[PDB]
Amino acid sequence: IVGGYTCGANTVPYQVSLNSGYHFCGGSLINSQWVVSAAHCYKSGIQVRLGEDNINVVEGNEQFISASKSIVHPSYNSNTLNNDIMLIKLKSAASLNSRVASISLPTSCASAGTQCLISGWGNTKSSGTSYPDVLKCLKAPILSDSSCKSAYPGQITSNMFCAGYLEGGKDSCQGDSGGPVVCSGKLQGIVSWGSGCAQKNKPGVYTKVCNYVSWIKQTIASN
Ligand SMILES: NC(=[NH2+])c1cc2nc(-c3cccc(-c4ccccc4)c3[O-])[nH]c2cc1Cl
Ligand SMILES: [Ca+2]
DSSP states (O other), X not given: OBSOEEOOTTSSTTXXXXXXXXXXXXXXXXXXXXXXXXXXXXXXXXXXXXXXXXXXXXXXXXXXXXXXXXXXXXXXXXXXXXTOOEEEEESSOOOOSSSSOOOBOOSSOOOTTOEEEEEESOOSOSSSOOOOSBOEEEEEEBOOHHHHHHHSTTOOOTTEEEESOTTOSOBOOTTTTTOEEEETTEEEEEEEEOSSSSOXXXXXXXEEGGGGHHHHHHHHHTO
C-alpha cells in the first residue's frame, strides 16, 4: 500500500496473508472455511495465515491453515486478467472471534464516489521494493467508469472497476494483490492490477465482486 497508514493489529479481521514460505498475496475470509483472492495469485502449496498483523513475528492470534483446494474461475484469462477471482477452501475451519471474522458479500454493486478500505502487506514505494511487516490501510474512492476507461483504454471489462487517486501518491501495489476492497462493510473488490503503483492517471483496477456473488455461492455450495 503506497501512501497508506498502519491499520492497527487486528482491526481488519477478514484480511488473510497467502504464504508459500513468504507472503505473496492477500485474501478475504468469507466464512470459516473459505477465502477469496485473485486467480493470478494461484499456486500450490499455499498456507493461509489469519489473525496476522506483523507477518514476520508470531505475536498471538494467528491461525495457519493449509488450503484444501483452490478454485480459479473457469473463465479466468491470464492475458486480460478478466474474471480474476479464486476461492480457497481451508483444510479445517478457522475459529472466528473478534480478531478473525468473515466479511459479507454485496447485494448490489457500489457506485463511483463510494469510499472503500484497501489493506495489505504490499510494497509501500512506487519506485523500488519496500515491504512492511505490519498491515497497512488506505481509504480510496471507486472512480467513474469513464475515468477508468480513459486511464486504461481497451483494458477494462465489465468485471473490473477502478478506485484510487488520479493525482498519484496513494495506491495498492505488489504484495497487496488478492486482497480486499471493502465498502460499507461489504467485500466489493479484489486487488487485481494497475500500471506501476501510485502513478498519476493510473489508478488501481479491482475485480468487481458483485458480479460473482451467484458463482461464489453456487461453487461453495457444491464443494
Ligand atoms: N493498484 C495498483 N497499481 C496495483 C499494482 C499491482 N502490482 C501488482 C503485482 C506486481 C507484480 C507481481 C504481483 C504478483 C502477483 C501474484 C503473485 C506474486 C506477485 C503483483 O500482484 N499487483 C498489483 C495490483 C494493483 Cl491493484
Ligand atoms: Ca505475526
